[PDB]
């Protein structure tokens, strides 16, 4: 496929797109990433003590 | 106090402190034009008609703070 | 895309007097 | 290349040469001292800077004087 | 020539080596000839399948046939897995074949083998036809993607739906 | 050709380009490479501003069922943010056109078939234009204040000439 | 050898100090390959398009977080209980209590709370949905693309500007007075009349209905009048209510003084006249100077001409105006020196006279938004004076300032250095040594025997001001003086209420522990200018080296002789200010946050109690209140103090690696280097790999430089970290 | 809304590998 440094240059580039425009929607694993989940039970409390 | 006579009379005295009296002390691409004897083009007037204005402005705003505590 | 499609013509035309001021400077 | 330039109040007691790590220095006659010599530095090339010249000269407000120019890999010090 | 806007000049690298320097490169990517070698064949192979993609749906949006989207996923036999172990290994001895047609001898499509041209095709105005009907059925796939995104219904009754409607009914959503 | 028999500033007080009125106070008519560009530029400003005013003195006789303001977003064929790539193509393409070579308004998109007009209409066509640019931003002050309507201030002087002025309305 | 396009002699280096000085002089364009002054200017000013675009970028950018990221919808309505929102948080480094712990302010994911405090700067000039606040992320990001395209136009060699075009100091300094700063404050009252002040009020101005809406009732009538007071007349209320319109008012310049009732903030009314009154008064300082048309002042007339008679100054400040108009580093270190002091301004009158609605509420916004603009203002004015020492070098020229005021300073520049060194040694003598004093009552169990000065001259001040809590009744505590009684319908009631009101930063009821930490703000002051003065002054030369000059601003040294001369040059004196710097901003950031602690809890003696000896600022404030700092993360668990928690430990680990570039020297390392070049040219399958840049070991200026850019964010980012974590952490 | 997933991973892994890689190869550049 690629022999020169121009087609590895785009290679590289490429393979870069093909991860990282899918590991924003599919690829982020249920259990590696848990932004990539829903919304849990609580946490939206005042930063304690006072105001 | 008066809205019309102030204001006028402010830039009347100030347009001729500088035309009477100040003329040699302010003294001390061509646009400069001496056509009153001593220099007195709209670039002076408008000079002495922003101070005549400006304290005409500030005589009729103290006179109207509801009076003067001076 | 109302807003999207409407901002990239106006590109499209800020674009070509961008080629006009690429070439009329030097 | 460092810039060594020396000036006329030097007295020529060649201490500066014998300092000198790298043999940037030399003694050249002038009739402005008693020992009738005066520095001259040829090989500013091989200079790396190292002021060894200047610690050494008696003079006040010393008249050997090394300015710090760009160093290429002789100024450096480098055996790579 | 009239390039592709008024007063600009072509880069220095579009002197006619390729036919048509049309002066469209403001990414200056196509200076270096081992890359421009592969670029004409990107603005070949991208409209080579895409040319007969876009007659072969809209010859049959609205005859007998869903949507390409769920053209995919509709439940043929000996389910596509397997017809992709055909489909991948059949395409690539093609593929393997003119894999040293690439590099070595006789730049792709204006080959002209004996089954490949039977009836003798030409030289100049028959080379430009074929290339400007290549553009816009590139441009029309991703078209046809973004109408059926945008509008659910088909792409043929799109053109009605902006007959009936050139001021509100647009892309503009 | 003098503002006021006083003075006469500039180097370019001769050179003209048929379209001299002799006036330049603050310095912008110096630079000689520049004159070029000051003088077809006052020259746009007031064409486009000519089919400006026929356009907005022209509803007053005419229809006056578009007001001013909504003028610009009413009920039109395309939705009026829909319509602006029809503006961005089609103003800029006959634009362009007439930016090429500059050559002192060279026919290219605005040919004219003939009518050429070396001797003072072109000084004349630059006195039209140099007052119907005072017309737009007198059509863009005193309608501004959101006081008379498409254009009904004249028609109020010519009724009331000491009293409805400038000092004189003070109110919404 | 392609990389430093500016400095062929970096070109010709084989060594890798090529790329770090192709690096940090390549904006050092004075000193550039083939530069000349009219290329020297052109290529200044399109840069200063490059900071602006910059600045617009990243303003849209805090419009456009917020505006998608944030709870500025959801903060208008509650503004007090409601904690702001910066930035939503993806780091797919993070475990699920890690996401589970920011989600707060009633978000959905993982969030920022903003100490930055561009909520209550934004929802005081009439921002309130966040469909306002897009348009202006959108707005700015035009503006910065004009700047950008602007200095890419202003270099093409049609409109590259002429040489003289820079130098019309009148024409400048004409417009930026009139325009830049008169009609952008005019402009800017245009926005609060029109616009900021009615949205308080509860009344929706925006770009569609703001050429319906009348500011002012009968407006435009009194100023063409004359009856300016009609503008003044039904303020807001004592008991208005901020963004409604219940006890509403329709002033529009009003002059109160002191502070809203709920906000505790500043009144819009008195806002909008006070960028009026400059306003005015710039424009009008804005006809001063002769440019084009026969009238104003000559800056070649003025300077000159103020020479005092029998020799006081020497031959006056003759002949400054060609050494400054011609110097850029003597403009440069003028505006560091203005900009730096009004730096610091901003943020002495925003903690006591807080502008934004809200402010003074929320803690943490406060505690950054002083702590900011005071170490913004310390590197600031620490380089007035380091451009300051470059123009001794580069710029000055004793033919041409023969007598001058700026020679005199030469001149007598022992008597500078020495007079600062006995001040800087006095305030150390006697603030350490009091201290330590109280430190040893306090040790053997006797507080009374404390030295407790009481600052008699600043509650002498105070109280002239308007503080009774002393009882001076001096002039404004004084009720039957004549300050008192020529202002009680004027500006001062409103003024008088809001000192004498105990809980707010206005005029700080100060004691003895602030007595001995303003000595040691004067300390650090004046020990700062002298490091400062001193690498100004002896930029040129000493006893000890009279050449200084010749070998330029920053050099390292000159050599082992004449006793040896480590850190000689004005370089290295000015570098060694930056520790004093840090430390004298780090004293009045201590001062700051913990008397604002100990004011905000309650406990308003047990800063005074402890503020007089140094254990109590050990004890009671850094290990006291950076309780809940540590604990962001243990293991029992963690919470959102935690990114706080590791960054305090960042800030440690950056500030200790500075010690490295600082106590180890250059010398020790090439030697090292030497070893790892051996053992890579002599590595089996390693030898495949070799360098193109030799590698070098980091120069002696390159060492104070990465040294104490390690000390400095380490600091930086220590000190932020226990600043928001310990405010917001109580609060 | 799929946007912090995409544009971090741009920047922070993939535009700065464009900026290590470009701003790299420039710096050996032997001047012609
Ligand atoms: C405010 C931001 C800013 C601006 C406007 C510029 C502006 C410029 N830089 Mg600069 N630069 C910046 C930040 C900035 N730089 C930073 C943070 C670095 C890293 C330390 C550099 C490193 C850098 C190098 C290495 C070079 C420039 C060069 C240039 C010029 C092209 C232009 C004057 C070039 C230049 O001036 O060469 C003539 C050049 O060679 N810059
Ligand atoms: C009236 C016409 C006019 C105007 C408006 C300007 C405007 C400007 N010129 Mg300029 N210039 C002019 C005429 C004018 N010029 C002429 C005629 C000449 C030739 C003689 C020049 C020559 C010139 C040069 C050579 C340079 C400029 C620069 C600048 C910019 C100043 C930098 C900046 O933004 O800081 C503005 C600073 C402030 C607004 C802050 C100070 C204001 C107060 C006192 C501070 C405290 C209040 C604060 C605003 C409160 C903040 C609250 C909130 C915003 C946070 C600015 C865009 C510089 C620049 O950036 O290049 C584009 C530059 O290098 N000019
Ligand atoms: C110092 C001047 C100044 C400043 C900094 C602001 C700042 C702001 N105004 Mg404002 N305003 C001002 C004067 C000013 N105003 C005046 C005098 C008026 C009276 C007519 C208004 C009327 C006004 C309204 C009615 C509204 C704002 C709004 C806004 C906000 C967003 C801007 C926006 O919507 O962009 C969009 C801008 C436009 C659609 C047109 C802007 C007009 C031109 C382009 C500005 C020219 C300036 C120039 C480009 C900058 C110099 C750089 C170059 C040389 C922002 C807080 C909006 C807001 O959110 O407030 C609640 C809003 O609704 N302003
Ligand atoms: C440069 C800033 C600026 C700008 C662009 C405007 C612009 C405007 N003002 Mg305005 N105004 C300003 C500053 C400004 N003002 C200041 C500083 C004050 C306080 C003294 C006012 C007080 C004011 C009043 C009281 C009124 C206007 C009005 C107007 C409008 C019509 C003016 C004819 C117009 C939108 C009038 C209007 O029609 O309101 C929209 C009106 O009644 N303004
Ligand atoms: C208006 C602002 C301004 C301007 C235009 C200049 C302009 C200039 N200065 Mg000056 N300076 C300023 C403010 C300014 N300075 C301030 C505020 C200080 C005090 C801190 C100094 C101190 C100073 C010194 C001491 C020297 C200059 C020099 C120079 C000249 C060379 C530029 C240079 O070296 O850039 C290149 C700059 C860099 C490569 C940046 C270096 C790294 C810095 C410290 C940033 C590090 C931040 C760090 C990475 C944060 C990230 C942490 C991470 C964990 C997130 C140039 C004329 C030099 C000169 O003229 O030589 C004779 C010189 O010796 N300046
Ligand atoms: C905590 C650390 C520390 C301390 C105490 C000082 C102290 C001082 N520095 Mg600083 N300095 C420091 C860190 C420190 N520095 C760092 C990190 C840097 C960056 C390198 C600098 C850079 C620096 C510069 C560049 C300059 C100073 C100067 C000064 C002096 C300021 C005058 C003064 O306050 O005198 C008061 C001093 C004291 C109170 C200390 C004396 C302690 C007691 C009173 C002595 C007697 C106690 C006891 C009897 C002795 C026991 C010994 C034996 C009998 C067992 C003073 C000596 C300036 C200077 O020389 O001004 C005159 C100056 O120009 N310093
Ligand atoms: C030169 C040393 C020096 C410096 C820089 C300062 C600096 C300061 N003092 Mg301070 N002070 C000093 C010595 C000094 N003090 C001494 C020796 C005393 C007597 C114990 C005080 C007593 C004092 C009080 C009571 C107060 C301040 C305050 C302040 C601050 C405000 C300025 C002010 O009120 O002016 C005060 C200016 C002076 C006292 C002038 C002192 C200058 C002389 C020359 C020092 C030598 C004094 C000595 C008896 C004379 C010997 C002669 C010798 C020169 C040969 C400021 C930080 C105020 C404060 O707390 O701010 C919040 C405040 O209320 N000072
Ligand atoms: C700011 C940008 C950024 C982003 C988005 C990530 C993202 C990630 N890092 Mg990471 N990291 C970064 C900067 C970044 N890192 C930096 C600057 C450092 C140095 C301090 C580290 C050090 C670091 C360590 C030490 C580790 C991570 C790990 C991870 C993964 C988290 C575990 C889960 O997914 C787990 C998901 C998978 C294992 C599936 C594989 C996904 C890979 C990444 C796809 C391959 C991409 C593509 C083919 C090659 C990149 C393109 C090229 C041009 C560079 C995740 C992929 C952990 C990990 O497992 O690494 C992957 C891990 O061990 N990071
Ligand atoms: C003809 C003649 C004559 C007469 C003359 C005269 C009478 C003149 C006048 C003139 C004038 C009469 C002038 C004026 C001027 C003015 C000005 C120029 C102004 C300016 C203004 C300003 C600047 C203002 C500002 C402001 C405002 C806006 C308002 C408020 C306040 C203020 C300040 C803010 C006689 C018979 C003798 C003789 C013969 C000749
Ligand atoms: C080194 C040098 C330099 C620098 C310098 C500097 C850096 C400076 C700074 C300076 C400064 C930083 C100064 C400051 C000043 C200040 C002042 C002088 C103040 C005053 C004050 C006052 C006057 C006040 C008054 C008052 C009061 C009492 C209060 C109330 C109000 C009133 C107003 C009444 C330069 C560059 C030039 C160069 C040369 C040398
Ligand atoms: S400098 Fe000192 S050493 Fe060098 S020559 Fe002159 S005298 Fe001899
Ligand atoms: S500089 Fe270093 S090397 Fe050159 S002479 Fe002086 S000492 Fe010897
Ligand atoms: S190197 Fe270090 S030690 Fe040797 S002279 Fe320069 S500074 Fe002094």
Same mark, same amino acid.
């Given at each position: 496929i690629i022999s020169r440094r121009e087609s590895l240059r785009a290679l590289v580039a490429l393979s870069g797109i093909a991860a990282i425009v899918t590991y924003?929607?599919?690829?982020?694993?249920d259990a590696d990433?848990?932004?990539?989940?829903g919304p849990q039970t609580t946490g939206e409390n005042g930063k304690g003590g006072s105001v | 106090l008066d809205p019309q006579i102030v204001i006028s009379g402010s830039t009347a005295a100030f347009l001729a402190i500088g035309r009477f009296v100040f003329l040699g002390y302010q003294r001390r691409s061509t646009?400069?034009?001496?056509?009153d004897p001593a220099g007195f083009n709209i670039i002076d007037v408008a000079g002495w008609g922003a101070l005549g204005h400006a304290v005409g402005f500030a005589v009729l705003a103290i006179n109207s703070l509801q009076g003067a505590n001076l | 895309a109302a807003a999207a499609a409407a901002a990239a013509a106006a590109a499209a035309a800020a674009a070509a007097a961008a080629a006009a001021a690429a070439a009329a400077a030097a | 290349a460092h810039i060594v330039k020396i000036y006329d109040?030097?007295?020529?007691?060649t201490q500066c040469v014998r300092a000198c790590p790298l043999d940037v220095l030399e003694m050249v006659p002038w009739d402005g001292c008693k020992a009738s010599q005066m520095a001259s530095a040829p090989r500013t090339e091989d200079c790396?800077?190292?002021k060894r010249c200047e610690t050494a000269c008696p003079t006040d407000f010393l008249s050997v004087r090394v300015y710090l120019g760009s160093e290429s890999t002789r100024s450096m010090g480098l055996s790579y | 020539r009239p390039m592709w806007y008024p007063g600009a000049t072509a880069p220095?690298?579009?002197?006619?080596s390729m036919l048509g320097?049309?002066?469209?490169?403001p990414l200056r990517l196509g200076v270096n000839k081992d890359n421009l070698k592969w670029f004409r064949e990107a603005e070949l192979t991208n409209g080579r399948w895409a040319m007969a993609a876009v007659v072969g749906i809209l010859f049959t949006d609205a005859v007998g046939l869903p949507k390409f989207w769920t053209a995919g996923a509709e439940?043929?036999?000996?389910?596509?897995?397997t017809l992709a172990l055909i489909e991948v290994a059949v395409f690539a001895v093609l593929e393997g074949k003119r894999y040293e047609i690439y590099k070595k001898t006789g730049e792709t499509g204006?080959?002209?083998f004996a089954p490949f041209d039977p009836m003798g095709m030409k030289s100049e105005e028959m080379k430009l036809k074929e290339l400007k009907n290549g553009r816009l059925a590139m441009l029309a796939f991703l078209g046809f993607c973004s109408q059926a995104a945008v509008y659910g219904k088909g792409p043929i009754e799109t053109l009605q739906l902006h007959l009936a409607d050139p001021g509100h009914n647009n892309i503009y959503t | 050709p003098t503002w006021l028999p006083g003075l006469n500033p500039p180097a370019h007080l001769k050179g003209?380009?048929?379209?001299?009125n002799g006036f330049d106070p603050?310095?912008?008519?110096?630079?000689e490479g520049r004159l070029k560009w000051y003088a077809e530029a006052e020259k746009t400003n007031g064409r486009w501003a000519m089919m400006a005013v026929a356009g907005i003195l022209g509803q007053?006789?005419?229809?006056?069922?578009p007001a001013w303001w909504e003028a610009g977003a009413?009920?039109?064929?395309?939705?009026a943010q829909a319509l602006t790539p029809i503006e961005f193509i089609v103003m800029g393409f006959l634009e362009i056109k007439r930016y090429?070579?500059?050559?002192?308004?060279?026919?290219?998109?605005?040919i004219n078939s003939?009518?050429?007009?070396?001797?003072?209409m072109a000084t004349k066509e630059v006195k039209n234009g140099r007052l119907a640019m005072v017309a737009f931003i007198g059509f863009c002050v005193q309608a501004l204040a959101?006081?008379?309507?498409?254009?009904?201030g004249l028609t109020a002087h010519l009724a009331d000439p000491f009293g409805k002025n400038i000092t004189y309305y003070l109110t919404h | 050898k392609l990389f430093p396009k500016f400095s062929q002699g970096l070109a010709q280096?084989?060594?890798?100090?090529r790329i770090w000085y192709g690096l940090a002089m390549?904006?050092?364009?004075?000193?550039?390959?083939?530069?000349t002054e009219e290329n020297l200017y052109q290529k200044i000013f399109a840069s200063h398009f490059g900071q602006l675009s910059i600045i617009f970028l990243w303003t849209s950018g805090n419009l456009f977080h917020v505006a998608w990221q944030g709870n500025f919808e959801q903060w208008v309505t509650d503004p007090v209980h409601i904690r702001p929102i910066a930035h939503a948080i993806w780091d797919p480094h993070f475990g699920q209590p890690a996401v589970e712990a920011f989600?707060? =302010?009633?978000?959905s994911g993982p969030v920022n709370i903003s100490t930055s405090g561009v909520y209550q700067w934004w929802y005081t000039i009439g921002m309130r949905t966040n469909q306002d606040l897009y348009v202006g992320s959108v707005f700015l990001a035009l503006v910065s693309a004009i700047f950008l395209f602007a200095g890419w136009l202003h270099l093409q060699p049609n409109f590259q500007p002429s040489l003289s075009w820079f130098k019309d100091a009148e024409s400048r300094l004409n417009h930026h007075l009139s325009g830049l700063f008169g009609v952008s404050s005019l402009a800017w009252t245009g926005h609060l009349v029109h616009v900021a002040i009615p949205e308080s009020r509860g009344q929706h101005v925006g770009w569609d209905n703001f050429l319906s809406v009348?500011?002012?009732?009968?407006?435009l009538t009194p100023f063409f009048?004359?009856?300016?007071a009609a503008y003044a007349?039904?303020?807001?209320?004592?008991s208005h209510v901020f963004?409604?319109?219940?006890g509403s008012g329709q002033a529009i310049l009003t002059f109160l003084g002191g502070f809203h009732?709920?906000?505790?903030?500043?009144w819009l009314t008195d806002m909008a006249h006070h960028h009026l009154a400059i306003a005015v008064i710039f424009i009008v300082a804005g006809h001063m100077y002769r440019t084009n048309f026969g009238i104003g002042h000559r800056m070649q007339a003025i300077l000159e001409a103020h020479t005092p008679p029998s020799?006081?100054?020497?031959?006056?400040?003759? =002949?400054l105006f060609d050494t400054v108009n011609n110097s850029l580093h003597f403009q440069l270190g003028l505006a560091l020196a203005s900009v730096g002091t009004i730096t610091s301004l901003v943020a002495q009158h925003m903690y006591s006279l807080?502008?934004?609605?809200?402010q003074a509420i929320d803690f943490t916004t406060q505690a950054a938004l002083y702590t900011h603009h005071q170490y913004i203002a310390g590197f600031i004015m620490c380089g007035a004076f380091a451009h300051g020492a470059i123009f001794f070098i580069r710029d000055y020229d004793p033919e041409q300032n023969k007598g001058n005021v700026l020679a005199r300073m030469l001149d007598h520049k022992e008597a500078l250095i020495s007079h600062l060194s006995w001040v800087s040694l006095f305030l150390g003598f006697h603030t350490l040594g009091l201290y330590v004093h109280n430190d040893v009552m306090q040790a053997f169990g006797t507080p009374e025997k404390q030295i407790l000065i009481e600052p008699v001259f600043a509650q002498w001040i105070q109280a002239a001001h308007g503080?009774?809590?002393? =009882?001076?009744?001096?002039?404004?505590?004084?009720?039957?003086?004549a300050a008192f009684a020529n202002g009680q319908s004027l500006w001062l009631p409103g003024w008088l209420d809001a000192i004498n009101?105990?809980?707010?930063?206005?005029?700080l009821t100060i004691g003895p522990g602030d007595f001995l930490v303003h000595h040691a703000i004067a300390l650090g002051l004046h020990t700062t200018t002298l490091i400062l003065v001193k690498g100004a002054l002896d930029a040129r030369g000493?006893?000890?080296?009279?050449?200084?000059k010749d070998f330029g601003?920053?050099?390292?040294?000159? =050599?082992?002789?004449?006793?040896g001369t480590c850190d000689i040059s004005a370089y290295d004196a000015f570098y060694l200010a930056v520790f004093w710097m840090l430390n004298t901003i780090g004293w009045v950031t201590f001062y700051w946050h913990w008397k604002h602690l100990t004011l905000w809890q309650g406990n308003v003696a047990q800063f005074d109690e402890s503020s007089t000896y140094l254990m109590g600022w050990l004890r009671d404030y850094l290990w006291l209140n950076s309780s809940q700092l540590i604990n962001g993360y243990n293991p029992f668990g963690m919470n959102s103090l935690s990114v706080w928690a590791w960054t305090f430990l960042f800030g440690h680990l950056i500030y200790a690696t500075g010690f490295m570039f600082l106590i180890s020297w250059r010398g020790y390392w090439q030697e090292l280097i030497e070893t790892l070049v051996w053992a890579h040219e002599k590595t089996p399958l390693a030898n495949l790999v070799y360098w193109k840049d030799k590698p070098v070991a980091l120069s002696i200026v390159q060492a104070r430089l990465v040294g104490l850019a390690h000390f400095s964010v380490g600091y930086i980012f220590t000190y932020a970290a226990f600043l928001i974590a310990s405010t917001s952490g109580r609060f | 809304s799929w946007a912090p997933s995409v544009f971090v991973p741009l920047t922070g892994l993939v535009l700065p590998a464009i900026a290590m890689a470009t701003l790299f190869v420039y710096i050996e550049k032997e001047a012609p």
């Open positions: 924003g929607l599919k690829g982020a694993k990433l848990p932004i990539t989940k | 646009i400069f034009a001496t056509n | - | 109040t030097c007295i020529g007691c790396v800077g190292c | 220095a690298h579009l002197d006619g320097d049309y002066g469209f490169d439940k043929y036999a000996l389910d596509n897995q204006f080959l002209s | 003209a380009l048929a379209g001299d603050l310095g912008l008519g110096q630079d007053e006789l005419l229809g006056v069922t009413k009920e039109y064929d395309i939705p090429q070579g500059f050559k002192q308004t060279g026919t290219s998109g605005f003939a009518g050429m007009n070396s001797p003072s959101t006081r008379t309507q498409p254009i009904e | 280096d084989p060594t890798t100090r390549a904006h050092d364009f004075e000193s550039h390959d083939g530069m989600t707060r =302010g009633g978000a009348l500011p002012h009732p009968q407006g009048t004359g009856n300016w007349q039904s303020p807001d209320t004592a963004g409604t319109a219940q009732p709920q906000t505790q903030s500043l020799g006081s100054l020497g031959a006056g400040h003759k =002949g807080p502008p934004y609605a809200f503080k009774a809590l002393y =009882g001076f009744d001096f002039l404004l505590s004084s009720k039957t003086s009101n105990n809980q707010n930063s206005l005029f000493s006893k000890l080296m009279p050449d200084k601003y920053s050099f390292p040294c000159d =050599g082992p002789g004449r006793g | -």
